[PDB]
């Protein structure tokens, strides 16, 4: 639907949509920009991520509300209210899966294969792990283990690159470690791995802060605090 709009206009409108908190529009504009076939700059990758994280975040929050109602509906002593709660949870779930499949499709056609620099490749592989993680959050069937393994594999490739090619304070590296640690805790039933990863990431970043400017220090310490927040919650 965005094929007739200039790439630069799509990027401009994505930024306007962000200012207006119109994240569905923002995501549609950024999808259009990706489909122009050119690589994304750092700023453009961030716009893509912000847009879809906000869209799926709303869907995930709604899914959790509905899933909890459905759970309570199926306890002993609860009254049969019909198929409606399940139907509506399924509707939201299918829409969420559709957004995840769209993002994964953009990554596969063809953002990842053209991404050669560590900053872009790690960013996109992190995103791939994230959207498989969101699929795993709602999965229950024959392919659930395979969805979890797809998330794990993308995160692991991103980790391997990030450790070789980025400093331990790099914000992308830090955010990847944060999210892979959440994957371990919440998805893979591996709380010890989650804690170990968060701790080693935090400690290795702390030791590298001395190399940074004031502005980079602020960026890195912000994400380190998210790691610390999880460690405090989990221990």
């Amino acid at each position: 639907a965005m094929g007739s709009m200039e790439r630069a206009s799509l990027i401009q409108k994505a930024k306007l949509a962000e200012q207006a908190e119109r994240y569905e529009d923002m995501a549609a504009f950024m999808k259009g920009a990706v489909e122009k076939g050119e690589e994304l700059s750092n700023e453009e990758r961030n716009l893509l991520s912000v847009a879809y994280k906000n869209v799926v975040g709303g869907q995930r929050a709604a899914w959790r509300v509905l899933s909890s109602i459905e759970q309570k509906s199926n306890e002993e002593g609860s009254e049969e209210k019909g198929p409606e709660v399940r139907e509506y949870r399924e509707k939201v779930e299918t829409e969420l899966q559709g957004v995840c499949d769209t993002v994964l499709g953009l990554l596969d056609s063809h953002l990842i294969k053209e991404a050669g620099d560590a900053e872009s490749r790690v960013f996109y592989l992190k995103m791939k792990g994230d959207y498989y993680r969101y699929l795993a959050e709602v999965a229950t069937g024959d392919d659930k283990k395979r969805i979890i393994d797809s998330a794990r594999s993308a995160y692991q490739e991103a980790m391997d690159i990030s450790k070789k090619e980025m400093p331990p304070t790099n914000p992308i590296r830090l955010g990847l470690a944060l999210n892979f640690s959440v994957f371990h805790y919440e998805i893979a039933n591996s709380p010890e791995e989650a804690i170990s990863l968060a701790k080693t990431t935090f400690d290795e970043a702390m030791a590298d802060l001395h190399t940074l400017s004031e502005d980079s220090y602020k960026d890195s310490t912000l994400i380190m605090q998210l790691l610390r927040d999880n460690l405090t919650l989990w221990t």
């Binding site: 955010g175 999210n179 919650l233």
Partner: peptide
Amino acid sequence: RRRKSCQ
């Protein structure tokens, strides 16, 4: 308190 992921 919900755990943090990268927003």
